[PDB]
Design a protein around this ligand. Sequence first.
Ligand SMILES: NC(=O)c1ccc[n+]([C@@H]2O[C@H](COP(=O)([O-])OP(=O)(O)OC[C@H]3O[C@@H](n4cnc5c(N)ncnc54)[C@H](O)[C@@H]3O)[C@@H](O)[C@H]2O)c1
Ligand SMILES: NC(=O)c1ccc[n+]([C@@H]2O[C@H](COP(=O)([O-])OP(=O)(O)OC[C@H]3O[C@@H](n4cnc5c(N)ncnc54)[C@H](O)[C@@H]3O)[C@@H](O)[C@H]2O)c1
Ligand SMILES: NC(=O)c1ccc[n+]([C@@H]2O[C@H](COP(=O)([O-])OP(=O)(O)OC[C@H]3O[C@@H](n4cnc5c(N)ncnc54)[C@H](O)[C@@H]3O)[C@@H](O)[C@H]2O)c1
Ligand SMILES: NC(=O)c1ccc[n+]([C@@H]2O[C@H](COP(=O)([O-])OP(=O)(O)OC[C@H]3O[C@@H](n4cnc5c(N)ncnc54)[C@H](O)[C@@H]3O)[C@@H](O)[C@H]2O)c1
Ligand SMILES: O=C(O)c1cccc(-c2nnn[nH]2)c1
Ligand SMILES: O=C(O)c1cccc(-c2nnn[nH]2)c1
Ligand SMILES: O=C(O)c1cccc(-c2nnn[nH]2)c1
Ligand SMILES: [Ca+2]
Ligand SMILES: [Ca+2]
Ligand SMILES: [Ca+2]
Ligand SMILES: [Ca+2]
Lengths: 409, 410, 412, 410
Amino acid sequence: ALVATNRNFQRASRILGLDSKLEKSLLIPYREIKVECTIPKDDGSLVSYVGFRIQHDNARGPMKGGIRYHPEVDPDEVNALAQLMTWKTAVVDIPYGGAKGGIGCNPKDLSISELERLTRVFTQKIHDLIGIHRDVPAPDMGTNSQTMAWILDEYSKFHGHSPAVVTGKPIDLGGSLGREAATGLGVVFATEALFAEYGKSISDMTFAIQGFGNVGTWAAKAIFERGGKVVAVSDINGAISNPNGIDIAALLKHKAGNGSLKDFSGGDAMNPNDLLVHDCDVLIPCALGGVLNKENANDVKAKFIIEAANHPTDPDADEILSKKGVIILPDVYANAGGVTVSYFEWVQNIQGFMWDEEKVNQELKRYMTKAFNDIKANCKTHNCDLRMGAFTLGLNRVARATLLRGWEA
Amino acid sequence: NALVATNRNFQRASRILGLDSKLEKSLLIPYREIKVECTIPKDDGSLVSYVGFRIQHDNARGPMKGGIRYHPEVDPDEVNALAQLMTWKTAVVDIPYGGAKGGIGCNPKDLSISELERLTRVFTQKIHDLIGIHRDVPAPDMGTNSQTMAWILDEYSKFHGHSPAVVTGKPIDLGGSLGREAATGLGVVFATEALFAEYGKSISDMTFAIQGFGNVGTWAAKAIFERGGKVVAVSDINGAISNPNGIDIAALLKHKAGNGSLKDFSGGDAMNPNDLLVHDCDVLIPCALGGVLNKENANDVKAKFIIEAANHPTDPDADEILSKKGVIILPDVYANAGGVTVSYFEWVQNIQGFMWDEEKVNQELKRYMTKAFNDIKANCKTHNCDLRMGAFTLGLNRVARATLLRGWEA
Amino acid sequence: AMNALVATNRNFQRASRILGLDSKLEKSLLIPYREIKVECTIPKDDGSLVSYVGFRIQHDNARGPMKGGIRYHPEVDPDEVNALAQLMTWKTAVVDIPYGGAKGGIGCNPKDLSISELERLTRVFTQKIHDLIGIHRDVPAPDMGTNSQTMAWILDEYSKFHGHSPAVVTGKPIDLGGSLGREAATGLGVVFATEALFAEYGKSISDMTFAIQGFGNVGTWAAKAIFERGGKVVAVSDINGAISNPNGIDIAALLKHKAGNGSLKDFSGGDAMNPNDLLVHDCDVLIPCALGGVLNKENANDVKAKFIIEAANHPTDPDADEILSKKGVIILPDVYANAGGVTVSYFEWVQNIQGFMWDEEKVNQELKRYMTKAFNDIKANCKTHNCDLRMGAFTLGLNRVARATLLRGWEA
Amino acid sequence: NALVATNRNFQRASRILGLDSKLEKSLLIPYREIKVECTIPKDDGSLVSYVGFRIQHDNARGPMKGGIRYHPEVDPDEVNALAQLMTWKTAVVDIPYGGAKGGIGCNPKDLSISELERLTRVFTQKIHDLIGIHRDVPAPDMGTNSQTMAWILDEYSKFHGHSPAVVTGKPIDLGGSLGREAATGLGVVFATEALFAEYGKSISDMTFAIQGFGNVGTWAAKAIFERGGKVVAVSDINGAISNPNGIDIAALLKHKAGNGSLKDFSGGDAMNPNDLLVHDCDVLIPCALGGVLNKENANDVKAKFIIEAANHPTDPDADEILSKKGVIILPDVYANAGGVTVSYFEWVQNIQGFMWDEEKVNQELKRYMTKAFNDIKANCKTHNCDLRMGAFTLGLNRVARATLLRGWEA
Ligand SMILES: NC(=O)c1ccc[n+]([C@@H]2O[C@H](COP(=O)([O-])OP(=O)(O)OC[C@H]3O[C@@H](n4cnc5c(N)ncnc54)[C@H](O)[C@@H]3O)[C@@H](O)[C@H]2O)c1
Ligand SMILES: NC(=O)c1ccc[n+]([C@@H]2O[C@H](COP(=O)([O-])OP(=O)(O)OC[C@H]3O[C@@H](n4cnc5c(N)ncnc54)[C@H](O)[C@@H]3O)[C@@H](O)[C@H]2O)c1
Ligand SMILES: NC(=O)c1ccc[n+]([C@@H]2O[C@H](COP(=O)([O-])OP(=O)(O)OC[C@H]3O[C@@H](n4cnc5c(N)ncnc54)[C@H](O)[C@@H]3O)[C@@H](O)[C@H]2O)c1
Ligand SMILES: NC(=O)c1ccc[n+]([C@@H]2O[C@H](COP(=O)([O-])OP(=O)(O)OC[C@H]3O[C@@H](n4cnc5c(N)ncnc54)[C@H](O)[C@@H]3O)[C@@H](O)[C@H]2O)c1
Ligand SMILES: O=C(O)c1cccc(-c2nnn[nH]2)c1
Ligand SMILES: O=C(O)c1cccc(-c2nnn[nH]2)c1
Ligand SMILES: O=C(O)c1cccc(-c2nnn[nH]2)c1
Ligand SMILES: [Ca+2]
Ligand SMILES: [Ca+2]
Ligand SMILES: [Ca+2]
Ligand SMILES: [Ca+2]
């Protein structure tokens, strides 16, 4: 997370020839905030936490980023996550900068009313630092749409009804349709555009998918409905194989009945540790980072790797897979459908008028497609891989937004 | 009035949802009640003092919305019920507002046009800090009109900058929306179409008797007529006209515009207005007054559908009698919501800085009335209740879950 | 209470006639600037919901920010609450402090609520009205059912919305900007007003005997302040008993006796008395400091005092007023006599507005200046209108609010 | 050093108060910590980027107060300890402030005066929403001065209007207070009068040795001299001068102003500066550095009183040794508080829109220092502790009382 973002920035920065003093400024966050969050517990005794918000950059618009309720709050990693938000939003051309915040706590130690009091106190402590056009939080580790409802409710006492102050809200409070499928569907839209470069379609390819959660389930469904052959799916408990393509609609039925993959009758049970070296045209890691390293890299038999999980390829595998002719669609772009639909929720709220799910998906496609074209165009200016096309694209957009605004007081 | 009807429907819907009684109490208590002194100098230099008010009932689902009445009758419980009714109505058609109701206890016909302007501006000065484009958005009502709203807009904007969305019902020249005059009558016809689609039928299959021929009745009849429905009977306060082959509503409208009276229309036969509700037809549409259907005449109703365009036309006796006769009643809280819906669209257009054409207003109105009927119908399935309770439980449940999601900690 | 409604109405109508108030101006002065009711819902300590209605009547602000208490009390009759807010508008005008009147509260019984429920309720109430109050808009204060701890919570909650705002509320703890001199303010103000009254006759407090009904916050300090000025306190009663001494009670010793949980009847430096004879006791000066409605037609003819200082609110009903008047009894009216408390409350606001607290000698020096100036104005008014002291005070305050209103004007 | 001394004194005072451990955790966590990018163009057109910061420790007793340091070393733990020490110090002399501390990691010698102005204004733009007359009131510190404050005032006022009280230490021409230069040294002498009055003694009864002759030492020496005290020894970084009759401080000041060195003054005998702390006197006043009294020289101190004007001059080893010899030590947290106290008076005068003359400033400074000593001594009686713990328990408890009164519910 930390180490990948640092290296990718340094690689992209040298490709762009970034001015060293501009680079220094871009690395310094706009603002770092730490606040006391003290609440009474349900039994009346006090507990005290520190909440935080790193606001990295706002050259391209309000800041955007999750709120983590999690006990590990290493400042360098939180800073890297906020920077990564700044580059990711710039890659897909949404008008935001990057931020990241949270509270150093373990939510599983706290009752639902304690979580509410903690969230409202946190909002009271930062209400003057966020805002619909200033900094727009979202769920992350340890928070969810109920958390956002509390932030919305508390913030609105200080500034009036502000549905756009936060994304990831319950539908009943201005949340957007289409959020659940956003990332998985965005993966497939990105893949459509990539394959369009070869005049090929998803229906021409076979797919192996590692991980079968929110990203994995929706990606498989969208691939299956577009004629792709999902020939292998794994998750943490097992794996299933079918050289003629698994009936993914039927597989999802089985999963919903609390069944395990290997027990599916429309395929052959498989060892999950064989999923990455499986023979297929396209590999899509949707589980964990660091699954591709120097060890297994030569044994990957896929022609395309769609990085849906964050950082599944360490630099060792990247170099190895590159020379073999493997094309890797990078994580900062490939899984960006979620943050993109989060932008649409914000847009729908500032417009006072919600979109239907078909409009959400039409705009998601338009944004993911125009983003791939811009990445590919950058790869053609700098003669670099797709990962560097994306990072130079985002880094340059932040840089020239920063330069246009200027430096005088 | 509207108070007995609203309290009864709230209590029935509350029992069906199994609403927690302490949540129920909170939903009944208005967010805020305001009364302000409104004193103006008259044209002749003397002083007069009135009391203005704004009941802000609920804002769990969004900014409050509601009319301003210039009227001498300011009973607090009735005004509370009207504000409460707004909260449920906006929830029924899924527009992101809560309910409010305000006004000034005065008789507008005792005031000259300049006295009315000074009064409107003073009221705005006294409440400007309590309203706003995302807080509470007033609209016309009894005794006020689009000119009143222009004055509120102009005075409010001195305190907060140009804010066309602070009020709806504006003149077209100041950000008012197209499609407002037809909104309610057309919304009734969209609602009636969606109901008939449940039976695979069309408006063109039906005959219609319409009580009332004002802003709602004229536009409802026009929209029915242009869709091939047969409007066989129309009444208003002075008479009624009948034609079993369908009245030519286009000609009836020209007649009304030419200062004509219903019973003098030659393309039909004069009728006793008291025969309207018991007339032989498929669809009855009260568009005039409340309380017209009671235990006396309910058993004499000969229609299969009743589309409630006026507010509270069926008292509980008739609702009972009509149900076990197989009569299907589309409830007023939903059927006439086209007006409040286009009022929302005007706000949306102002918020978006860009007006819609009338085709777009009516396409969205249709989408909103249709999606609302489907949601009502789905509720009927889950709760095994009629359309009136499907609608009230839908709106009440939406307000309750917005409230529960927002929470209670300080 | 109910007596405050009837008394405030009668006094307003009487003063309005003496002044010849224009009836449309009078109609406007009776209509409050603003009436607010808000939902106040909180979780109880057990997690269940409870819902109350809070309210704030903002009667008048022609002369400055509104000022008035917050009552946590179950009886919230609109006409009475309205009368109380209006009474504050007249009271602040009588002593020339730059406030209008307001009155607010929550319909609840505080004894039913734990300290943590009361805090949550207070903060929610503040969240619901923070935009309607303010240091130069409306400044609440303690009242029935609230105290300085309640004010600390309002201050803490209000300041989240507007920054640290110590002047938004008076009656605060000393630790949070409260003023010195609050405890003695009303009783000490009573004695200052009495000094000014007796000066008209070339007499001083050391010349008089005093009978005092009630021995709480007002009665103890008034008796103490009289005693230190050489007045002879010959009778004191409270709800449980009474003590008399025609030579004067050693009030310093009486106060020590009370502080040790002693009863007035059991005091050794006097003779026990029937409390029902306190008002007809043989003295120069009678000071009701307990309850309203104590002087009526039954007993007015038997009052032996030549001066009665109304420290409690409305202790004399209209029947006794007429009877005492024709007997030559001079009545210093409650609206003025007990105004020391609200005056030091203004001083707290002033100290917070100035960012710099006064010492107690300064507070009291100013309290005396304000009560003495106020008496001179009341007396001057009695000269021009040829009326008793009660109407001197009401016409003074009513006229000041009227003139502030007329100067501000009526055009939008 | 401020981190280990402040932590040791807090923990000791907390154990004396029986402070609840969960309250103590809250009191140690700062209200808010801010870091902001401060980038400016240099005079030559190139860019430079610094990090500005503001630690806002506590505001239970009032707006935050604290200096702004332009200095390259910005250790977070040291800056937190300084902001927290401010919170206790303001509570000890009972001024209505909490503690804060901020600055910019830069070397002001590397920057021209116009670059320093732009940097100050950029810093102000980045934090204007976090400071304010009733929120957080900065002041000069290392590397900043009254010209820096004028720039902050000037830039802040573009965002919130003319706000003279947003910063203290301003030039006299822009709302600064009279009496600010002498404030600390004069405050030291007021504190000493209050202490000596407990013994029925006066300053004129005592002999004084002063280490350091800067802004604190010169004014304390002057204020002692005008009260009949005998200043028998003075040192600074380059030398020392001695006179058991009492040095003519008026002449010594005039010598210093004429660019003279202590060892070259003729109205005394030149002395080794290393002998100042062991000089023969009743009262020793460290006004130079911390850590000058330790176990090595503590047994050799001949004074009966030590007035801590410098910060942390006595380590715990010497404090132990001196107390067992019967030495009374007036603690730094109180003794040197005249500077912060007059800074409060500047803020007061600004919010009152009307400046005081220097007579009134010094009169109020004396009243504040006198009442603070009385409160400290009362605390010593209550807890049976020395003056240092009398002062810290006083300040810590006042902050604890204010946060407990304010409460914890959301
Ligand atoms: N959901 C989003 O909006 C989003 C956006 C950007 C990136 N991502 C990335 O996508 C990845 C997955 O996100 P998600 O929401 O689908 O998570 P999820 O928890 O919904 O699903 C994770 C899936 O991976 C499987 N898995 C876990 N450990 C595994 C292991 N060791 N080997 C194989 N399979 C394993 C799980 O069983 C599950 O099927 C993460 O890297 C995340 O950072 C998600
Ligand atoms: N216009 C809207 O947007 C709207 C919205 C919701 C509800 N409503 C309800 O619709 C009803 C009518 O509204 P409108 O705007 O069309 O009013 P309107 O004044 O424009 O027309 C009322 C019509 O009813 C007739 N009428 C009056 N009394 C009658 C009686 N006793 N018997 C028969 N006819 C009678 C009048 O002559 C006229 O034809 C009212 O109940 C109103 O509350 C209107
Ligand atoms: N305290 C103030 O700041 C203040 C200010 C203005 C007016 N007042 C008025 O002063 C009166 C007393 O106020 P307080 O603060 O001293 O009250 P308190 O509760 O502190 O004391 C009231 C006293 O009256 C006594 N008492 C009660 N019933 C009695 C009876 N039937 N006969 C004799 N004594 C009786 C009580 O025992 C007690 O001694 C009230 O009318 C109040 O409205 C008080
Ligand atoms: N000035 C204030 O407002 C203020 C307020 C509170 C505390 N203090 C503390 O007072 C002390 C001095 O402050 P100041 O403003 O007078 O400083 P200053 O820089 O104006 O003067 C310091 C003096 O100490 C002398 N000195 C330096 N090192 C010395 C050494 N090793 N031996 C002997 N003398 C030495 C210098 O020569 C000079 O005379 C510091 O500890 C500071 O933290 C100052
Ligand atoms: O009168 C109200 O309370 C009110 C408030 C907002 C909109 C509408 C409306 N427009 N058309 N029909 N109703 C009415
Ligand atoms: O009750 C009020 O309305 C009110 C408001 C502010 C101050 C006081 C007060 N203090 N002492 N006596 N009265 C009363
Ligand atoms: O530097 C600080 O923390 C600070 C903040 C406000 C005032 C003072 C001050 N004035 N004189 N001595 N100290 C210092
Ligand atoms: Ca930066
Ligand atoms: Ca409610
Ligand atoms: Ca009025
Ligand atoms: Ca803290």
